[PDB]
Amino acid sequence: GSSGSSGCPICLEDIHTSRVVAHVLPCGHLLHRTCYEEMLKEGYRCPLCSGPSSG
Ligand SMILES: [Zn+2]
Ligand SMILES: [Zn+2]
């Protein structure tokens, strides 16, 4: 379950700035320097910010 839509939608693990760097998306979300590199390859953008048909 997930009540708060605040967290890396890639790995789904509470991000910890202190622990590791967080990539602030241009939409208003945080990611993991690593994850941000994975999603880019796959071909999917912020799966949280609903968009058009695609995505
Ligand atoms: Zn992540
Ligand atoms: Zn977003």
Side-chain angles (χ1 to χ4, degrees):
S2 176
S3 165
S5 279
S6 309
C8 193
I10 289 90
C11 56
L12 311 153
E13 294 190 39
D14 43 80
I15 305 162
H16 276 300
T17 52
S18 295
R19 271 167 175 195
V20 302
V21 299
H23 172 70
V24 184
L25 281 166
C27 48
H29 287 102
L30 299 293
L31 297 170
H32 296 110
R33 180 84 167 72
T34 58
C35 297
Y36 183 65
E37 275 198 77
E38 301 274 65
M39 72 175 253
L40 276 162
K41 298 160 182 196
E42 278 271 273
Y44 72 78
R45 296 90 80 85
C46 190
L48 297 166
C49 291
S50 169
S53 169
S54 77

